Amino acid sequence: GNIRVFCRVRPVLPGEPTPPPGLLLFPSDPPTRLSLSPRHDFSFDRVFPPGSGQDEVFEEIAMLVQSALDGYPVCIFAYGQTGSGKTFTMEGGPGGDPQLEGLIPRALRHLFSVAQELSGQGWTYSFVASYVEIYNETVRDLLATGECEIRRASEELTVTNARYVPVSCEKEVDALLHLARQNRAVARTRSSRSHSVFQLQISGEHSSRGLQCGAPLSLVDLAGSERSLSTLGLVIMALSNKESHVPYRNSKLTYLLQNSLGGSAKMLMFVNISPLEENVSESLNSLRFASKVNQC
Ligand SMILES: Nc1ncnc2c1ncn2[C@@H]1O[C@H](COP(=O)(O)OP(=O)(O)O)[C@@H](O)[C@H]1O
Ligand SMILES: [Mg+2]
Known part of the structure; x- marks a missing residue:
């Protein structure tokens, strides 16, 4: 839907x-x-050509992202083979060039400023970020300073032994991504075979009216697909076909995100594609996966 x-x-x-x-x-x-090259023909909500800039990629989804201020869960995925651009799309460049920043800092910046617009209407917003890595049934805290388990609250899920960091400006968000890159660098003494899961709990509360709102925003830099991951597809289709059973528990990723997948959750699926001739075989795989999601 x-x-x-x-x-x-x-x-x-x-x-x-x-x-x-x-x-x-x-x-x-x-x-x-x-x-691709009767000739394989696909169609999606948007196809960004190679000359697409980071700012344009985010602007396409800015409005869906801010619905997470309105109690809608939002879950964004980057999917594709290694080297196709999942991490560039999600995090962006590692050098602080503001034109190369990806979805995570642009989402959070956009949320910070819609929240400030809405504070003149009596709202106060709180933002709490976490970042964890899921590698072959193991969970590590990418924000460690300085064993992790997916546990229950009620019915919410958190990750034990992981930092949950209140953030309120762009610099604090950037610093968390740079800490994630430091912890990955130290772990060399792997991430191409790991899901990287960035979560922001959004709490809103009105001053004079008895209103509260809340929702998770998740930004997921998936493991590469080449030649865990198959479970995500199974979970998405089970919801499409309104199955009585949805096997969230079959993978640590779907188990963690189970409350941001079904229901009213808005789901954004970026499929990254390598332009190279040698990768045409895995690009077809990724495009079929994406075509399947778009019909679900
Ligand atoms: N849209 C893009 N524009 C410019 N360079 C890109 C883009 N996407 C990826 N790259 C470059 O391609 C290489 C692989 O990207 P990366 O995001 O690490 O792949 P993945 O995370 O999919 O394994 C990196 O050097 C990155 O800088
Ligand atoms: Mg990557």
């Missing part, structure tokens, strides 16, 4: 073999079709 699927093809980078210019076309409100 309220599932949006977006496709993103990254630019060809230095050193990489130059692909045939007809390997990927982008025919012609935003562009929506991707053509």
